[PDB]
Design a protein around this ligand. Structure first.
Ligand SMILES: [Zn+2]
Lengths: 155, 323, 56, 53, 125, 195, 38
């Protein structure tokens, strides 16, 4: 849908520099060449895919001193990204929040080895989403027969 | 050279002014408690409210003149707002055909498209294309999630570290690749060795864990009382045990009494022992010292401090009905 | 020649660690309520918009 | 009404479809959209022994 | 060449439990004779209900053909079709059966939908 | 030797574990037919049993998919292999066999007037394939539990082979605990029948 | 003891499909097409 989307694309403003030591173009190359491929899916389906639009500078990209063009009010100054440890449970999320197939978490809970305590909570909310999916159709099937995949698909 | 605030994780909320004027523009008219016959949601630019097609037609469906809503909205929203920022306006229409609208910061999708410098139809789900869209740090998603709380009255809740994963999730759903996650490493720092980085991370992450723990600690304190009551885990139960405890009440509730924190009222050796032996009768958990039973069964989603507070005799000895 | 099952030296008659997977789609008895769930009326679940909206 | 071969081939299409008995024969009636009506095929309501087995 | 009326006679029940590699599969529940044309009608009618992006339909045509005209003579428990995943998509039995329900009727003898792995014929029969 | 006289079946040592009635498991010595022995040998699944090979051999675990699994054949393995073989020998014997039954049928719908019980499934098992088992191990289908077997044509029923987890029998059979016993009942007149 | 794992339980009445419940009607669906032998 076209509604609720930005009609203009403001730019990045770099306020202060995260490092005091400027990098060589050969460092900026070896880092950017590291990010051009990345993994998708976590399981026996694991696919190396190519990442479009990799920023020129890796060191200077998201990590600090950059102002985001998310500003909203008139007097709102573009928020300047602060240091890593200043953001709560960020290192924790670097472990916790990623793509988890349910199987993968289940066997972690049964082996009693969790990467993070949050993966507990991650698991339960997953299970709930699945049986939610169950509870919905059971409410729909209640009112009329809804037959799965009997209709012709596409055109 | 400058680093603005260097402290263990006190960057949580946005600054003062944003929170204040957002407090008095984004807001909740108190729920009048009538029967709502329409719950409406619109995407409306800051300065421009029109009597045009969506809102005009929809108001003319109830015979209401749309000019007044447009005027109050424009007078409220035209100062204070940068142009071309689309807001969510939710209009609740009751059976008196009297109404109440709320104004809300743009959809998270908007913030994601702006933070990526990506306009419309440049971004899509990975398997549908087979290539990620632009890289994103978790640093950015924290300042996207900063902007959407549940209630502007208390921007704290829900706690940041949780609701970040929502934004991260939506972004992921859009085909956005990530740094600290979706890839084995984190964005390279120039000034340090890798063991420096990781030895930083290991202490920082646990400092965060402590802070968060005390946060949901007092957070739980603020809530109504019933959550600090006893909900025992059903997980340690051996599945036949669960369902056969569903076939009759006495198993489940004697289990409830047998494992309860030691507290002035629920602490009795006489009725507790024969409860444990009534459970041992039908072969419910038989290897248990009572004091590890107060451990294995405890509210698991209950935070740390109140749980060690409950597992302890002294801190739980203080609360008694006086008179 | 005649053929006959060997005796049982060790372990259970019916395999345990070697168990085959069932072959029925494992819809949980509790996940899709149809039958085989014996629940005391006290414990009746999922009434969240009906009787369990006004609990106890 | 469309005649299905057995009870299992019966199904409720509407919100308004009900099961109903026509003299020991099980059927589906729709007060709205009558094209929804389904008879499970069975003996005529009035049969004798010589006439219908 | 020029085999008599009784040859490749299906009428036994087979001892081989099929091994289906696809995520779901369609299996013969009896003995009978199936023409190719029928299996192509079944193929198309199945393909219609398949979400082509996430799936691929494997048909087994490699069994012998017998003179009548050329058709197949099938034993019980012979695999016909397979729903093979291209991605992480995981179907229920409801969905699988709903999919193969399209192509079942064109096949003149009874069939059952079986899950990935070795057919459990204690459950199926 | 001669192209005329060809060895009926020739001894073989197995490396992989092959599914069917001919195939064995890893580390067992068995004589199978020429055709299958050759197609096993050139495919690297089986070898010609020289002495030091009988003492020990390189077999393969299906996970690693290279022949890394060394099993030397000693007394306590040899006995185990003997039992394992003696088990899935019964197994393959029964499942490949089809036990012919013939009987009397009067009246109309296709019924044996003297239905089969569990004792005479076990009986024919002996009479034909010389499979001697405890008949209480046999079980019937649900539909036939009430009436006995009783219907003409093709029936089947399940035989439970109890002991194997100890012989480590998995994936080399169609399933661990059962065998489908295939019965066929043919109606014959008083000349050729009993009962 | 063979009687543990071997079941003779003759089920007298065959359990029917629950038409008296709307949801248990659709959930219990047996998808099947009857075929007369050829
Ligand atoms: Zn209807």
């Amino acid at each position: 849908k076209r509604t609720g989307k930005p009609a203009d694309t403001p730019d990045y403003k770099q306020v202060y520099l995260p490092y005091d030591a400027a990098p060589t173009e050969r460092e900026l190359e070896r880092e950017r060449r590291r990010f051009k491929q990345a993994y998708h899916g976590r399981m026996e389906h694991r696919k190396l895919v190519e990442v479009k639009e990799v920023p020129l500078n890796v060191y200077t990209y998201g990590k600090e001193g950059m102002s985001l063009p998310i500003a909203i009010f008139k007097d709102q100054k573009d928020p300047v990204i602060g240091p890593e440890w200043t953001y709560p449970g960020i290192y924790e999320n670097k472990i916790a929040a990623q793509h988890w197939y349910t199987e993968e978490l289940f066997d972690k809970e049964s082996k009693e080895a969790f990467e993070s305590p949050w993966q507990q909570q991650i698991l339960d909310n997953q299970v709930k989403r699945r049986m939610a999916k169950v509870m919905f159709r059971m409410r729909q099937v209640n009112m009329k027969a809804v037959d799965l995949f009997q209709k012709e698909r596409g055109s | 050279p400058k680093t603005v605030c260097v402290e263990p994780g006190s960057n949580r909320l946005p600054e003062a002014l944003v929170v204040e004027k957002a407090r008095d523009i984004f807001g909740r008219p108190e729920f009048p408690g009538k029967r709502v016959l329409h719950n409406w949601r619109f995407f409306i630019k800051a300065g421009k409210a029109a009597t045009g097609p969506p809102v005009g037609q929809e108001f003319s469906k109830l015979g209401l003149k749309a000019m007044d809503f447009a005027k109050v909205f424009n007078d409220r929203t035209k100062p204070h707002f940068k142009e071309d920022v689309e807001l969510i306006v939710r209009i609740q229409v009751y059976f008196d055909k009297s109404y109440l609208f709320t104004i809300e910061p743009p959809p998270t999708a908007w913030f994601i498209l702006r933070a990526l410098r990506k306009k419309r139809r440049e971004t899509g789900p990975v398997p549908l294309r087979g290539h990620y869209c632009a890289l994103m740090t978790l640093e950015m998603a924290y300042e996207i999630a900063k902007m959407k709380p549940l209630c502007w009255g208390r921007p704290e809740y829900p706690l940041l570290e949780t609701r970040v994963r929502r934004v991260v999730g939506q972004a992921r759903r859009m085909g956005v690749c990530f740094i600290g996650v979706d890839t084995p490493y984190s964005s390279p720092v120039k000034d340090m060795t890798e063991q420096q980085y990781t030895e930083e991370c290991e202490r920082y992450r646990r400092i965060h864990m402590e802070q968060y723990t005390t946060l949901r600690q007092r957070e739980l304190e603020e809530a109504p009382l019933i959550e600090r009551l006893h909900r025992p885990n059903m997980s340690p139960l051996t599945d036949e045990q669960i369902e056969e405890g569903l076939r009759d009440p006495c198993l489940l509730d004697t289990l409830w009494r047998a494992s309860h924190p030691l507290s002035p009222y629920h602490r009795d050796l006489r009725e507790r022992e024969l409860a444990r032996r009534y459970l041992n009768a039908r072969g419910w958990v038989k290897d248990m010292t009572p004091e590890e039973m107060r451990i294995v069964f405890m509210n698991y989603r209950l935070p740390e401090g109140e749980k060690r507070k409950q597992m302890d005799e002294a801190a739980m000895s203080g609360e008694v009905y006086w008179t | 020649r005649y053929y006959a099952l060997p005796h049982l030296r060790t372990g259970p008659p019916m395999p345990t660690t070697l168990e085959q997977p069932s072959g029925e789609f494992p819809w949980g008895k509790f996940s899709t309520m149809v039958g085989g769930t014996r629940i005391h009326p006290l414990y009746r679940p999922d009434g969240f918009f009906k009787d369990n909206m006004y609990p106890a | 009404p469309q005649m299905v071969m057995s009870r299992d081939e019966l199904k409720l299409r509407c919100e308004y479809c009900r099961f109903e008995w026509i003299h020991d024969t099980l059927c589906v009636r729709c007060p709205a959209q009558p094209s929804h009506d389904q008879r499970e095929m069975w003996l005529h309501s009035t049969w004798m022994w010589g006439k219908q087995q | 060449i020029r085999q008599f009326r009784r040859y490749g006679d299906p009428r036994y029940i087979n001892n081989e439990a099929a091994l289906i590699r696809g995520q779901w599969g369609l299996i013969t529940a009896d003995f009978g004779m199936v023409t190719q044309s029928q299996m192509e009608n079944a193929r198309l009618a199945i393909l219609r209900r398949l979400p082509r992006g996430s799936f691929t339909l494997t048909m087994h045509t490699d069994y012998e053909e017998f003179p009548v005209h050329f058709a197949f003579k099938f034993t019980t428990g012979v695999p016909l079709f397979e729903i093979m995943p291209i991605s992480a998509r995981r179907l229920n039995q409801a969905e699988a059966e709903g999919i193969f329900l399209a192509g079942r009727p064109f096949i003149p003898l009874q069939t059952v939908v079986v899950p990935q792995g070795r057919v459990d014929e204690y459950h199926v029969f | 030797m001669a192209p005329e006289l060809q060895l009926e079946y020739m001894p073989v040592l197995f490396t992989r574990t092959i599914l069917g009635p001919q195939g064995g498991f890893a580390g067992e010595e068995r004589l199978v037919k020429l055709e299958v022995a050759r197609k096993y040998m050139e495919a690297g699944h089986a070898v010609t049993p020289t002495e030091e090979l009988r003492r020990g051999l390189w077999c393969y675990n299906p996970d690693t998919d290279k022949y890394d699994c060394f099993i030397e054949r000693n007394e306590e393995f040899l006995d185990f292999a003997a039992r394992k073989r003696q088990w899935l020998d019964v197994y393959w014997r029964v499942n490949t066999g089809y036990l012919l039954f013939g009987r009397q049928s009067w009246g109309q719908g296709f019924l044996i007037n003297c239905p089969l019980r569990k004792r005479d499934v076990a009986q024919k098992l002996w009479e034909q394939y010389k499979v001697r088992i405890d008949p209480r191990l046999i079980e019937f289908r649900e539909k036939d539990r009430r009436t006995g077997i009783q219907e003409l044509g093709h029936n089947w029923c399940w035989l439970y082979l109890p002991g194997a987890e100890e012989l480590g029998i998995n994936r080399e059979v169609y399933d661990n605990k059962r065998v489908k016993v295939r019965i066929h009942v043919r109606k014959m007149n008083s000349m050729f029948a009993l009962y | 003891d063979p009687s543990a794992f071997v079941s003779d339980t003759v089920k007298l009445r065959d359990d029917k499909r629950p038409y008296w419940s709307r949801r248990r009607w659709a959930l219990t669906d047996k998808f099947l097409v009857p075929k007369s032998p050829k």
